[PDB]
């Protein structure tokens, strides 16, 4: 570790901890920047040499973390919990958590290599056609197939091809990662890595609180599921759709069946009302990636939040490179921890759902811009779910028919009950369909980290959860050679997921509060906070707090409640919740999937007829 980056000496008291945190911040920003920059160079240009440099940067970060972590525990282990300065407690508490820096050097190198290799496998996996040369990438190729194809056999080829190509090679690496991760965090005092991940929410009742939320939300999902299953039955037939069983997992518009907005055209209750999927208009009008990011930016500035700085436009990767070089296409927003460089890396496609993704990612950037002057350790969301909700909340306003009209994406304006059902159904396909998936992913991973799910049951327990919560089934047979959890980005890239369940609840609490602050006095689902500087100032207070204060208190200040609450989501959706319940009763639907063992047959002449 460079001498200038090494911890000096400080008193064993709070006043020494304060000087300790300032000296830490100085060197931490440099160590973080080199690490983030190395990751950027790799993720925008996947090569063996760039992976080598990223692993070296990661090792330097662990060296820094160990030196300052062990100094913090040498001086302040018994006194940090009683500091008068609450923010200093939070800084010290972070510095003393060593994580992977607890591993001996050889195991640190093994850990870093596993992360690099798992990331490379996921982001370079291809589905090749039997033209053995011609191969499809996840983004854009397979994504577009899952979204736009209505051929059962083609969707099956993409789904199976992807899950086999990405998942199978990941499994042995993921087992080794799990063990090393647990070994590291057990030395921080946690029973397993999942216990450390859950500790970020600082709630002893976290898992019970989540379960109580899901109980309130499940009836909405069950009714949406049944309605969509009926629509799929009308298209695909009784051979491929069981009206009393799970839905085949490749028919819902998305590789993970996690959002169903891409099948809206098949389920739209009132098709002679305005077409709320504006993708065709974006195409017809010549929208490009840069337009989408500028439109998102202008929403933020309309609230008197910050525009994207020049460094963002100069540094960001907003389209998949055409030079063919391999990149991580999965969208992400980057803080370089130097208070200057902030970037998005997105293989942007011109679609309405991608416009939502742009807002999501710009939400992350806006957070970074607002807390850039806090101590580096507090440059975080109040909890990780706050960070995920910011851009989604703005996108709730952007997607309203009234707002789409303002930005020239929807000429026809209507305010009637049928148009409301259409819109709320489209929003339910995006938001309510996700809830079971957002809930289940880390239930699977918590079980893996705790040892309840050993490698011999990775796929068994994955599909148990997928059927239990989402009510879907794999469209081809799977066994424990398959590792279908690994075919979802966040698993090999070791990104926790419960934040997204939290953020899908929170964003409606936020929306309700901002709409009220904006002076809006109509239905919650028609609110548009565009150009509300009052709403912007309330949101700005959250963003500037970072993780300096307990999230329960930040939430109370914003929305008047100190807890996650499903009521605002329920209130947003109430008209379509009622409508879907009535429609399923009239149609005699069975809610749920009592034929839990059912799987669709293979197409005749599959995969042979894929050409």
Ligand X SMILES: *[C@@H]1O[C@H](CO[C@@H]2O[C@@H](C)[C@@H](O)[C@@H](O)[C@@H]2O)[C@@H](O[C@@H]2O[C@H](CO)[C@@H](O[C@@H]3O[C@H](CO)[C@@H](O)[C@H](O)[C@@H]3O)[C@H](O)[C@H]2NC(C)=O)[C@H](O)[C@H]1NC(C)=O
Ligand Y SMILES: *[C@@H]1O[C@H](CO[C@@H]2O[C@@H](C)[C@@H](O)[C@@H](O)[C@@H]2O)[C@@H](O)[C@H](O)[C@H]1NC(C)=O
Ligand Z SMILES: *[C@@H]1O[C@H](CO)[C@@H](O)[C@H](O)[C@H]1NC(C)=O
Ligand U SMILES: CCCC[C@H](N[C@@H](CCc1ccccc1)C(=O)O)C(=O)N[C@@H](Cc1ccc(O)cc1)C(=O)O
* 484 lines the binding site for Zn ion (CB under 5 A): no
Check the annotation: does 294 bind a ligand: no
Among 11, 47, 191, 585, binds ligand Z (CB under 6 A): 47
* CA dihedral for 570, 572, 578, 579, sign (positive or negative): negative
Query: Among residues 486, 445, 498, which one has the least CA distance to residue 182?
Result: 445
Residue 126 β-bridge partners: 137
Q: Give how far the C-alpha of residue 332 lies from the chain's centroid of Cα atoms, to the nearest Å.
A: 9
* C-alpha R_g of the chain: 24
Contact 226, 591 (CB under 8 A): yes
Among 18, 27, 35, 50, binds ligand Z (CB under 6 A): 50
Among 272, 411, 521, 604, binds ligand X (CB under 6 A): 521
The option from ligand Y, Zn ion, Cl ion, none interacting with 384 (CB < 5 to 8 A, set by class) reads Cl ion
Nearer to ligand U, 334 or 551 (CB): 334
Query: Among residues 601, 599, 585, which one has the least CA distance to residue 226?
Result: 585
Q: How far is 600 from 605, CA to CA, in rounded Å?
A: 15
The option from Mg ion, ligand Y, Zn ion, none interacting with 262 (CB < 5 to 8 A, set by class) reads Mg ion
Nearer to Mg ion, 139 or 353 (CB): 353
For ligand X, the binding residues in 393-422 under the rule CB under 6 A are: 402, 415
* 331 lines the binding site for ligand U (CB under 6 A): yes
Q: After which residues is the chain broken (C to N over 2.5 A)?
A: 130
Check the annotation: does 360 bind a ligand: yes
Nearer to Zn ion, 341 or 388 (CB): 388
Active site residue 326: no
3-state secondary structure at position 43 = helix
The option from ligand Z, Cl ion, ligand U, none interacting with 332 (CB < 5 to 8 A, set by class) reads ligand U
Structure tokens at 138: 């996840």
* 381 lines the binding site for Cl ion (CB under 5 A): no
Cis-peptide, bond into residue 607, ω within 30° of zero = yes
In the complex, least distance from residue 259 CB atom to ligand U, rounded to whole angstroms: 6
Nearer to ligand Y, 481 or 578 (CB): 481
3-state secondary structure at position 126 = strand
* 476 lines the binding site for ligand Y (CB under 6 A): yes
Nearer to ligand X, 203 or 526 (CB): 526
Contact 496, 197 (CB under 8 A): yes
The tokens 């983004």 sit on which residue? 139
Q: How far is 566 from 498, CA to CA, in rounded Å?
A: 16
Q: Which stretch binds ligand X (CB under 6 A): 97-105, 145-153, 519-527, 544-552?
A: 519-527
Query: 18 CB contacts (<8 Å, ≥6 apart)?
Result: 85, 88
Q: How far is 485 from 453, CA to CA, in rounded Å?
A: 13
CB atoms within 10 A of CB 71: 19
Check the annotation: does 250 bind a ligand: no
In the complex, least distance from residue 115 CB atom to Cl ion, rounded to whole angstroms: 18
In the complex, least distance from residue 392 CB atom to ligand U, rounded to whole angstroms: 5
Q: How far is 55 from 289, CA to CA, in rounded Å?
A: 32
Among 14, 353, 420, 442, binds Mg ion (CB under 5 A): 353
In the complex, least distance from residue 528 CB atom to ligand X, rounded to whole angstroms: 8
Active site residue 582: no
DSSP for 515-526, written as a single string = HHHTT--S-GGG
Check the annotation: does 499 bind a ligand: yes
* 384 lines the binding site for Cl ion (CB under 5 A): yes
In the complex, least distance from residue 597 CB atom to ligand Y, rounded to whole angstroms: 15
Q: Hey, which residues are catalytic here?
A: 361, 490
Binding site for ligand X (CB under 6 A): 402, 415, 521-523, 526
Q: Specify binding-site residues for chloride.
A: 201, 499
Binding site for ligand U (CB under 6 A): 258, 330-333, 356-357, 360-361, 364, 388, 392, 489, 493, 495, 500
Q: Specify binding-site residues for Zn(2+).
A: 360, 364, 388
Binding site for Zn ion (CB under 5 A): 388
Binding site for ligand Z (CB under 6 A): 45, 47, 49-50, 325
């Amino acid at each position: 570790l460079d001498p200038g980056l090494q911890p000096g000496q400080f008193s064993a008291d709070e006043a020494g901890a304060q000087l300790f945190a300032q000296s830490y911040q100085s060197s931490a920003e440099q160590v973080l920047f080199q690490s983030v920059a190395a990751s950027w160079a790799h993720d925008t240009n996947i090569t063996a040499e760039n992976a080598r440099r990223q692993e070296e940067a990661a090792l330097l970060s662990q060296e820094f973390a160990e030196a300052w972590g062990q100094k913090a525990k040498e001086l302040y282990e018994p006194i940090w919990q009683q500091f008068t300065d609450p923010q200093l407690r939070r800084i010290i508490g972070a510095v003393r958590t060593l994580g992977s820096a607890n591993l001996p050097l050889a195991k640190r190198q093994q850990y870093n290599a596993l992360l690099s290799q798992m990331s490379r496998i996921y982001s370079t996996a291809k589905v090749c056609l039997p033209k053995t040369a011609t191969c499809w990438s996840l983004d854009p190729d397979l994504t577009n197939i899952l979204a736009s194809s209505r051929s059962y056999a083609m969707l099956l080829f993409a789904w199976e091809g992807w899950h086999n190509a990405a998942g199978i090679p990941l499994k042995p690496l993921y087992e080794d990662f799990t063990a090393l991760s647990n070994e590291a965090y057990k030395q921080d005092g946690f029973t397993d890595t999942g216990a450390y991940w859950r500790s970020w929410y600082n709630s002893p009742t976290f898992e019970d609180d989540l379960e109580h939320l899901y109980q309130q939300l499940e009836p909405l999902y069950l009714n949406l599921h049944a309605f969509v299953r009926r629509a799929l039955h009308r298209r695909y037939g009784d051979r491929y759709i069981n009206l009393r069983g799970p839905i085949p997992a490749h028919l819902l518009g998305d590789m993970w069946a996690q959002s169903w907005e891409n099948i809206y055209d098949m389920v739209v209750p009132f098709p002679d009302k305005p077409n709320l999927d504006v993708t065709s208009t974006m195409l017809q009008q010549g929208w490009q990636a840069t337009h989408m990011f500028r439109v998102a930016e202008e929403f933020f500035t309309s609230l008197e939040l910050s525009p994207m700085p020049p460094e963002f436009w100069e540094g960001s990767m907003l389209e998949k490179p055409a030079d063919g070089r391999e990149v991580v296409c999965h969208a992400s927003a980057w803080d370089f921890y130097n208070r200057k460089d902030f970037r998005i890396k997105q293989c942007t496609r011109v679609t309405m759902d991608q416009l939502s993704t742009v807002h999501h990612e710009m939400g992350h950037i806006q957070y970074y811009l607002q807390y850039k002057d806090l101590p580096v350790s507090l440059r975080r969301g109040a909890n990780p779910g706050f960070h995920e909700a910011i851009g989604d909340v703005l996108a709730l306003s952007v997607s309203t028919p009234e707002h789409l009209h303002k930005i020239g994406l929807l000429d026809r304006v209507t305010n009637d009950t049928e148009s409301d059902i259409n819109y709320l159904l489209k929003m339910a396909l995006e938001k309510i369909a996700f809830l079971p998936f957002g809930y289940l992913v880390d239930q699977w991973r918590w079980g893996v980290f705790s040892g309840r799910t050993p490698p011999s049951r990775y796929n068994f327990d994955w599909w148990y959860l997928r059927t239990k919560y989402q009510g879907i089934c794999p469209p081809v047979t799977r066994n424990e050679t398959h590792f279908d959890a690994g075919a979802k980005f966040h698993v090999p890239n070791v990104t926790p997921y419960i934040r997204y369940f939290v953020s899908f609840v929170l964003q409606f609490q936020f929306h309700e509060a901002l709409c009220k602050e904006a002076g809006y006095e109509g239905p919650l689902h028609q609110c548009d906070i565009y150009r509300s500087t009052k709403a912007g100032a309330k949101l700005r207070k959250v963003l500037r707090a970072g993780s300096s204060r307990p999230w329960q208190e930040v939430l109370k200040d914003m929305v008047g409640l100190d807890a996650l609450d499903a009521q605002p989501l329920l209130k947003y959706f109430q008209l379509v919740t009622q409508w879907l319940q009535e429609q399923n009763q009239q149609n005699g639907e069975v809610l749920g999937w009592p034929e839990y063992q059912w799987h669709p047959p293979l197409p005749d002449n599959y995969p042979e007829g894929i050409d």
